[PDB]
Design a protein around this nucleic acid. Structure first.
Ligand code: DTP
Ligand code: CA
Ligand code: CA
Length: 268
DNA sequence: ATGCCTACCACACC
DNA sequence: GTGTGGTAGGA
Protein backbone atom coordinates (compact mmCIF):
# COMPACT_ATOMS: atom_id res chain seq x y z
CA UNK A 1 0.00 0.00 0.00
CA UNK A 2 2.85 2.28 0.98
CA UNK A 3 4.93 0.45 -1.65
CA UNK A 4 2.69 1.55 -4.53
CA UNK A 5 2.32 5.13 -3.29
CA UNK A 6 6.05 5.84 -3.49
CA UNK A 7 6.16 4.03 -6.84
CA UNK A 8 3.61 6.42 -8.38
CA UNK A 9 4.91 9.47 -6.49
CA UNK A 10 8.29 9.04 -8.19
CA UNK A 11 6.55 8.49 -11.54
CA UNK A 12 5.01 11.97 -11.47
CA UNK A 13 8.25 13.50 -10.15
CA UNK A 14 10.20 12.20 -13.17
CA UNK A 15 7.30 12.95 -15.54
CA UNK A 16 2.29 -7.20 -43.03
CA UNK A 17 5.25 -7.52 -40.66
CA UNK A 18 5.49 -10.43 -38.20
CA UNK A 19 4.24 -10.14 -34.61
CA UNK A 20 7.10 -8.45 -32.75
CA UNK A 21 7.06 -6.65 -29.39
CA UNK A 22 10.26 -4.70 -28.67
CA UNK A 23 9.53 -1.56 -26.64
CA UNK A 24 12.16 0.43 -24.75
CA UNK A 25 11.39 2.80 -21.89
CA UNK A 26 13.58 5.29 -20.07
CA UNK A 27 11.66 4.67 -16.83
CA UNK A 28 10.83 1.37 -15.15
CA UNK A 29 7.26 2.42 -14.33
CA UNK A 30 6.50 3.02 -18.01
CA UNK A 31 7.70 -0.49 -18.87
CA UNK A 32 5.46 -2.12 -16.26
CA UNK A 33 2.57 0.04 -17.45
CA UNK A 34 3.03 -1.43 -20.93
CA UNK A 35 3.22 -4.98 -19.55
CA UNK A 36 -0.17 -4.52 -17.86
CA UNK A 37 -1.63 -3.29 -21.18
CA UNK A 38 -0.05 -6.03 -23.33
CA UNK A 39 -2.08 -9.19 -23.93
CA UNK A 40 1.03 -11.27 -24.68
CA UNK A 41 3.31 -12.78 -22.03
CA UNK A 42 5.93 -10.04 -22.03
CA UNK A 43 8.53 -9.31 -19.34
CA UNK A 44 10.83 -6.47 -18.31
CA UNK A 45 14.59 -6.54 -18.87
CA UNK A 46 17.06 -3.95 -17.60
CA UNK A 47 19.88 -2.89 -19.94
CA UNK A 48 23.00 -1.04 -18.81
CA UNK A 49 23.93 2.00 -20.89
CA UNK A 50 27.41 2.76 -22.19
CA UNK A 51 27.86 5.08 -19.20
CA UNK A 52 30.08 3.72 -16.44
CA UNK A 53 27.36 4.16 -13.82
CA UNK A 54 24.44 1.83 -13.15
CA UNK A 55 22.06 3.70 -15.44
CA UNK A 56 19.50 1.29 -16.87
CA UNK A 57 17.19 1.32 -19.89
CA UNK A 58 14.18 -1.00 -19.77
CA UNK A 59 13.15 -3.40 -22.54
CA UNK A 60 9.79 -5.16 -22.86
CA UNK A 61 9.33 -8.30 -24.98
CA UNK A 62 8.69 -12.03 -24.72
CA UNK A 63 11.29 -14.55 -23.60
CA UNK A 64 11.30 -16.18 -27.04
CA UNK A 65 11.88 -12.94 -28.94
CA UNK A 66 14.48 -11.70 -26.45
CA UNK A 67 16.48 -14.91 -26.81
CA UNK A 68 16.25 -14.61 -30.61
CA UNK A 69 18.26 -11.37 -30.71
CA UNK A 70 20.29 -12.22 -27.57
CA UNK A 71 21.72 -15.72 -28.04
CA UNK A 72 24.49 -14.70 -30.45
CA UNK A 73 25.96 -12.53 -27.65
CA UNK A 74 26.93 -9.95 -30.29
CA UNK A 75 24.23 -7.50 -29.15
CA UNK A 76 22.26 -7.06 -25.93
CA UNK A 77 25.33 -7.31 -23.72
CA UNK A 78 25.04 -6.49 -20.01
CA UNK A 79 21.37 -7.37 -19.52
CA UNK A 80 19.47 -7.95 -16.27
CA UNK A 81 16.17 -9.58 -15.37
CA UNK A 82 13.82 -7.32 -13.42
CA UNK A 83 12.17 -9.42 -10.70
CA UNK A 84 8.75 -7.72 -10.40
CA UNK A 85 7.41 -6.98 -6.95
CA UNK A 86 4.49 -9.17 -5.85
CA UNK A 87 5.30 -11.66 -8.63
CA UNK A 88 5.74 -15.35 -7.85
CA UNK A 89 9.38 -16.33 -8.19
CA UNK A 90 11.88 -19.12 -7.68
CA UNK A 91 14.26 -19.51 -4.76
CA UNK A 92 17.53 -17.91 -5.85
CA UNK A 93 20.85 -16.97 -4.27
CA UNK A 94 23.60 -14.44 -4.85
CA UNK A 95 26.91 -15.84 -3.59
CA UNK A 96 30.10 -13.79 -3.29
CA UNK A 97 33.34 -13.46 -1.39
CA UNK A 98 36.71 -11.83 -1.99
CA UNK A 99 39.41 -14.40 -2.69
CA UNK A 100 42.45 -12.55 -1.22
CA UNK A 101 40.64 -11.92 2.08
CA UNK A 102 39.63 -15.62 2.30
CA UNK A 103 42.67 -17.72 1.38
CA UNK A 104 41.41 -21.01 2.80
CA UNK A 105 37.88 -20.66 1.44
CA UNK A 106 36.71 -23.41 -0.92
CA UNK A 107 33.70 -21.75 -2.52
CA UNK A 108 32.83 -24.92 -4.42
CA UNK A 109 32.37 -26.66 -1.06
CA UNK A 110 30.57 -23.82 0.72
CA UNK A 111 28.03 -23.95 -2.12
CA UNK A 112 27.44 -27.68 -1.63
CA UNK A 113 27.09 -27.24 2.13
CA UNK A 114 24.71 -24.31 1.61
CA UNK A 115 22.49 -26.30 -0.76
CA UNK A 116 22.26 -29.19 1.70
CA UNK A 117 21.19 -26.87 4.53
CA UNK A 118 18.61 -25.04 2.41
CA UNK A 119 17.20 -28.33 1.13
CA UNK A 120 16.83 -29.53 4.73
CA UNK A 121 15.17 -26.24 5.67
CA UNK A 122 12.69 -26.51 2.80
CA UNK A 123 11.90 -30.07 3.92
CA UNK A 124 11.32 -29.22 7.59
CA UNK A 125 9.58 -25.86 7.10
CA UNK A 126 7.55 -26.55 3.94
CA UNK A 127 7.72 -30.30 3.34
CA UNK A 128 9.38 -29.51 0.01
CA UNK A 129 11.76 -32.16 -1.36
CA UNK A 130 14.76 -31.10 -3.43
CA UNK A 131 18.49 -31.72 -3.82
CA UNK A 132 21.51 -30.27 -5.60
CA UNK A 133 20.19 -31.81 -8.84
CA UNK A 134 17.43 -29.16 -8.76
CA UNK A 135 19.82 -26.19 -8.42
CA UNK A 136 21.08 -24.33 -11.48
CA UNK A 137 24.64 -23.27 -10.58
CA UNK A 138 25.94 -20.24 -12.49
CA UNK A 139 29.42 -18.76 -12.13
CA UNK A 140 30.96 -15.37 -12.87
CA UNK A 141 34.16 -15.58 -10.84
CA UNK A 142 37.40 -13.72 -11.50
CA UNK A 143 40.93 -13.70 -10.11
CA UNK A 144 39.69 -11.46 -7.28
CA UNK A 145 36.05 -12.47 -6.68
CA UNK A 146 34.32 -15.82 -6.28
CA UNK A 147 30.85 -15.21 -7.71
CA UNK A 148 27.97 -17.66 -8.17
CA UNK A 149 24.25 -17.41 -8.84
CA UNK A 150 22.01 -20.28 -7.75
CA UNK A 151 18.45 -20.64 -9.05
CA UNK A 152 16.40 -23.47 -7.54
CA UNK A 153 14.14 -25.43 -9.90
CA UNK A 154 11.51 -26.73 -7.49
CA UNK A 155 8.82 -29.12 -8.73
CA UNK A 156 5.47 -27.30 -8.76
CA UNK A 157 6.64 -24.93 -6.00
CA UNK A 158 7.41 -21.22 -5.90
CA UNK A 159 7.62 -18.35 -3.43
CA UNK A 160 4.92 -15.70 -3.27
CA UNK A 161 7.54 -13.11 -4.26
CA UNK A 162 11.22 -12.34 -3.82
CA UNK A 163 10.54 -10.42 -0.59
CA UNK A 164 9.20 -13.64 0.93
CA UNK A 165 12.30 -15.45 -0.34
CA UNK A 166 14.39 -12.98 1.65
CA UNK A 167 12.27 -13.50 4.77
CA UNK A 168 12.75 -17.26 4.40
CA UNK A 169 16.54 -16.93 4.15
CA UNK A 170 16.90 -14.40 6.97
CA UNK A 171 14.91 -16.85 9.10
CA UNK A 172 16.97 -19.97 8.39
CA UNK A 173 20.27 -18.04 8.33
CA UNK A 174 19.68 -16.31 11.67
CA UNK A 175 22.37 -18.49 13.34
CA UNK A 176 24.99 -17.40 10.79
CA UNK A 177 23.86 -13.78 11.19
CA UNK A 178 24.54 -14.08 14.92
CA UNK A 179 28.12 -15.20 14.24
CA UNK A 180 28.74 -11.74 12.75
CA UNK A 181 23.62 -25.64 13.97
CA UNK A 182 27.13 -24.61 12.90
CA UNK A 183 26.79 -22.31 9.88
CA UNK A 184 30.27 -20.77 10.23
CA UNK A 185 31.21 -21.89 6.71
CA UNK A 186 28.99 -19.03 5.50
CA UNK A 187 31.10 -16.39 7.28
CA UNK A 188 33.61 -14.59 5.04
CA UNK A 189 35.63 -11.37 5.10
CA UNK A 190 35.48 -8.51 2.61
CA UNK A 191 38.28 -6.29 1.30
CA UNK A 192 38.36 -4.30 4.56
CA UNK A 193 38.34 -7.37 6.82
CA UNK A 194 34.73 -7.01 7.97
CA UNK A 195 32.96 -10.32 8.56
CA UNK A 196 30.04 -10.83 6.17
CA UNK A 197 27.84 -13.70 5.03
CA UNK A 198 28.62 -15.80 1.97
CA UNK A 199 24.96 -15.24 1.04
CA UNK A 200 24.18 -11.68 -0.06
CA UNK A 201 20.84 -10.93 1.61
CA UNK A 202 20.43 -7.58 -0.16
CA UNK A 203 19.15 -8.97 -3.48
CA UNK A 204 15.67 -9.62 -2.12
CA UNK A 205 14.28 -6.13 -2.75
CA UNK A 206 11.38 -4.88 -4.83
CA UNK A 207 12.17 -4.90 -8.57
CA UNK A 208 15.71 -6.16 -7.91
CA UNK A 209 17.58 -6.61 -11.16
CA UNK A 210 19.50 -9.87 -11.55
CA UNK A 211 22.22 -10.26 -14.17
CA UNK A 212 21.11 -12.55 -16.97
CA UNK A 213 22.69 -15.84 -17.91
CA UNK A 214 25.53 -15.07 -20.37
CA UNK A 215 25.64 -11.35 -19.48
CA UNK A 216 28.39 -9.35 -17.77
CA UNK A 217 28.53 -6.02 -16.00
CA UNK A 218 29.29 -3.08 -18.28
CA UNK A 219 32.60 -2.55 -16.49
CA UNK A 220 33.88 -6.12 -16.67
CA UNK A 221 33.83 -8.84 -19.35
CA UNK A 222 33.05 -11.95 -17.27
CA UNK A 223 29.58 -13.30 -18.09
CA UNK A 224 27.45 -15.68 -16.05
CA UNK A 225 27.94 -19.24 -17.31
CA UNK A 226 26.85 -22.66 -16.10
CA UNK A 227 29.32 -23.81 -13.45
CA UNK A 228 31.60 -26.76 -14.14
CA UNK A 229 30.02 -28.81 -11.33
CA UNK A 230 26.43 -27.75 -12.03
CA UNK A 231 24.05 -30.65 -11.46
CA UNK A 232 20.73 -29.38 -12.86
CA UNK A 233 20.01 -30.65 -16.38
CA UNK A 234 16.82 -29.42 -18.09
CA UNK A 235 14.64 -32.00 -19.81
CA UNK A 236 15.88 -32.01 -23.39
CA UNK A 237 13.26 -31.11 -26.01
CA UNK A 238 13.44 -31.38 -29.79
CA UNK A 239 11.62 -28.04 -30.17
CA UNK A 240 13.98 -25.76 -28.19
CA UNK A 241 17.75 -25.53 -27.90
CA UNK A 242 19.48 -26.63 -24.71
CA UNK A 243 20.81 -23.10 -24.17
CA UNK A 244 17.27 -21.69 -24.33
CA UNK A 245 16.27 -24.25 -21.70
CA UNK A 246 19.08 -23.06 -19.43
CA UNK A 247 18.06 -19.46 -20.11
CA UNK A 248 14.45 -20.13 -19.11
CA UNK A 249 15.60 -22.08 -16.04
CA UNK A 250 17.89 -19.20 -15.05
CA UNK A 251 15.07 -16.64 -15.07
CA UNK A 252 14.05 -16.13 -11.44
CA UNK A 253 10.57 -14.86 -12.35
CA UNK A 254 9.88 -17.58 -14.95
CA UNK A 255 7.79 -19.87 -12.76
CA UNK A 256 6.67 -22.89 -14.77
CA UNK A 257 2.91 -23.23 -15.07
CA UNK A 258 1.58 -26.14 -13.01
CA UNK A 259 -1.98 -27.25 -12.28
CA UNK A 260 -0.94 -28.04 -8.67
CA UNK A 261 1.43 -25.18 -7.86
CA UNK A 262 2.28 -24.61 -4.20
CA UNK A 263 3.09 -21.01 -3.24
CA UNK A 264 5.34 -20.58 -0.20
CA UNK A 265 4.98 -17.54 2.06
CA UNK A 266 7.16 -16.36 4.94
CA UNK A 267 6.55 -13.26 7.06
CA UNK A 268 9.22 -11.38 9.04
C1' DA B 1 15.78 9.97 -17.51
C1' DT B 2 17.98 3.45 -12.69
C1' DG B 3 15.90 1.32 -8.47
C1' DC B 4 16.07 0.21 -4.13
C1' DC B 5 16.73 0.65 1.09
C1' DT B 6 19.86 -1.04 4.92
C1' DA B 7 23.53 0.13 8.14
C1' DC B 8 24.94 3.92 10.55
C1' DC B 9 24.78 7.61 13.51
C1' DA B 10 22.88 11.61 16.22
C1' DC B 11 19.53 12.69 19.04
C1' DA B 12 15.79 12.49 22.63
C1' DC B 13 13.79 9.64 26.13
C1' DC B 14 13.72 6.58 30.18
C1' DG C 1 19.11 0.73 27.58
C1' DT C 2 14.69 1.53 24.04
C1' DG C 3 13.02 4.64 20.98
C1' DT C 4 12.34 6.94 17.09
C1' DG C 5 14.07 9.78 13.07
C1' DG C 6 17.35 11.34 8.96
C1' DT C 7 20.87 10.14 5.57
C1' DA C 8 24.97 8.27 2.72
C1' DG C 9 26.50 4.43 0.50
C1' DG C 10 26.34 -0.29 -1.79
C1' DA C 11 23.82 -3.76 -4.79
N1 DTP D 1 23.84 0.03 -9.26
C1 DTP D 1 22.85 -0.88 -9.41
N2 DTP D 1 21.61 -0.53 -9.80
C2 DTP D 1 20.62 -1.43 -9.95
N3 DTP D 1 20.79 -2.75 -9.73
C3 DTP D 1 21.99 -3.24 -9.34
C4 DTP D 1 23.11 -2.32 -9.16
N4 DTP D 1 24.17 -3.05 -8.77
C5 DTP D 1 23.76 -4.34 -8.72
N5 DTP D 1 22.46 -4.45 -9.05
C6 DTP D 1 21.71 -5.73 -9.11
C7 DTP D 1 22.14 -6.44 -10.38
C8 DTP D 1 23.03 -7.57 -9.88
O1 DTP D 1 22.91 -8.73 -10.71
C9 DTP D 1 22.55 -7.82 -8.46
C10 DTP D 1 23.67 -8.33 -7.57
O2 DTP D 1 24.73 -7.38 -7.56
P1 DTP D 1 26.27 -7.84 -7.50
O3 DTP D 1 26.37 -9.10 -6.67
O4 DTP D 1 27.08 -6.63 -7.12
O5 DTP D 1 26.64 -8.18 -9.04
P2 DTP D 1 26.41 -9.62 -9.72
O6 DTP D 1 26.07 -10.63 -8.65
O7 DTP D 1 25.48 -9.45 -10.90
O8 DTP D 1 27.87 -9.94 -10.30
P3 DTP D 1 29.15 -10.12 -9.33
O9 DTP D 1 28.54 -10.49 -7.99
O10 DTP D 1 29.95 -11.22 -9.97
O11 DTP D 1 29.81 -8.76 -9.35
O12 DTP D 1 22.04 -6.57 -8.00
CA1 CA E 1 26.71 -11.43 -6.74
CA1 CA F 1 26.20 -9.35 -3.97
Amino acid sequence: MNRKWEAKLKQIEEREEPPSIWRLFHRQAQAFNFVKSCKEDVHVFALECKVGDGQRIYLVTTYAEFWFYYKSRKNLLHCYEVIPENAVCKLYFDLEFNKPANPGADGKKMVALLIEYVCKALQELYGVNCSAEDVLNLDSSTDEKFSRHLIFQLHDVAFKDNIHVGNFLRKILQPALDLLPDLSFLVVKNNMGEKHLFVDLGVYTRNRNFRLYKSSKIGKRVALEVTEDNKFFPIQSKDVSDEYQYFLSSLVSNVRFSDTLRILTCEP
